[PDB]
């Protein structure tokens, strides 16, 4: 009859995706741990040539290392749900979100440092890039401030259709509050850093195209690679999140097929974004001759 129009939309999940997700998460854990540990070792073994970039890379590697350290519990939760308790849900979510925000903001600050060092090299503004310590401390504090909502408003949620989750419980109107809270990661995590990076790197490229240095081309390639990597890693997740927000807000018509598609896309894009902890050491640090030479020396 016509009652088929009104029917529950059964949530769908598969075990093959579970197995694949576990494999990917474990591989990422191992790779990120290795890379971050190597970077920290190289930077800290010798105090000679401790420059601003070294400090920024140190903080970034620390953040990525903590993110990787938190990953495995997230993988187990994706496997069978949150059986580990409320306290661990709170702590792990706090640590993960803090490190994610810190990594993004440190990437933006690195872009700013490069802009100041190249475009304003001959000016007096480049003397303001010796404040790495205070800037990084402020970035960490701001990341901590922006992740309080996760610690305060998260707990274990037990449903019938689906396994338990480390979700948010803000009250009766939890859905809309969660939607609003989602604005912070998409503003202080995607848009602001992306705009800053684009501005700084574009002016940097404009200066570098006008110069006669032999090694300009490789710098251009590296900057383009960094921007493209950031986009590939983060843009899909935010686009899917925006689509979900619109679908909940009825701007886009809601249907079960769209729900399943968006859930799968969220999982895939979270997996894709998680790759930022493994590629940052290669893109930002290991592509420099100084780091490679230091590593080879340390292996002695």
């Amino acid at each position: 009859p016509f009652l088929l129009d009104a029917a529950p939309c059964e949530p769908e999940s598969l075990e093959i995706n579970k197995y694949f997700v576990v494999i990917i998460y474990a591989l990422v854990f191992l790779l990120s741990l290795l890379g971050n540990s190597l970077v920290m070792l190289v930077i800290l073994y010798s105090r000679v040539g401790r420059s601003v970039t070294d400090v920024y890379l140190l903080n970034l590697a620390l953040a990525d290392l903590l993110f990787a350290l938190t990953l495995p519990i997230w993988a187990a939760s994706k496997v069978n749900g949150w059986i580990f308790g409320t306290f661990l849900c709170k702590v792990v979510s706090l640590l993960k979100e803090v490190n994610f925000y810190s990594g993004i903001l440190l990437l933006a600050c690195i872009s700013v440092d490069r802009y100041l060092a190249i475009v304003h090299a001959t000016r007096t503004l480049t003397q303001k890039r010796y404040l790495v310590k205070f800037i990084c401390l402020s970035i960490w504090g701001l990341s901590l401030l922006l992740a309080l909502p996760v610690l305060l408003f998260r707990r274990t949620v037990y449903s019938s259709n689906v396994s338990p989750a480390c979700y948010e419980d803000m009250g009766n109107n939890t859905a809309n509050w969660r939607m609003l809270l989602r604005i912070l990661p998409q503003s202080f995590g995607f848009i602001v850093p992306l705009l800053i990076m684009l501005f700084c790197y574009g002016f940097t490229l404009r200066t570098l195209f006008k110069a006669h240095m032999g090694q300009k081309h490789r710098a251009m390639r590296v900057i383009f690679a960094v921007v493209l990597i950031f986009l590939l890693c983060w843009l899909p997740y935010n686009l899917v999140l925006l689509a979900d927000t619109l679908m909940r807000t009825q701007v886009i018509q809601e249907t079960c097929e769209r729900r399943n598609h968006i859930d799968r896309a969220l999982d895939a894009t979270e997996i894709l974004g998680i790759l930022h902890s493994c590629l940052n050491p290669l893109i930002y640090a290991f592509i420099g001759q100084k780091f490679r030479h230091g590593l080879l020396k340390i292996l002695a």
Partner: protein, 65 residues
């Protein structure tokens, strides 16, 4: 991500065909109460929480004898 279980709602179903009534209260999953009716046919429907029909149905089911 947790989502509501009932996208569209129905108000008319014969009580004699109802076997189960599952009530989800307001919480993180959804912002509105939602009642799911599982019939003897093996199908499922989403009733209107605010309709008079639900209360009478529940009263009848709890007073079979």
């Amino acid at each position: 991500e947790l989502r509501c279980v009932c996208l569209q709602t129905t108000q008319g179903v014969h009580p004699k065909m109802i076997s189960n009534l599952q009530v989800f209260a307001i919480g993180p999953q959804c912002s509105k109460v939602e009642v799911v009716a599982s019939l003897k046919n093996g199908k499922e429907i989403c009733l209107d929480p605010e309709a008079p029909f639900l209360k009478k149905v529940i009263q009848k089911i709890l007073d079979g004898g």
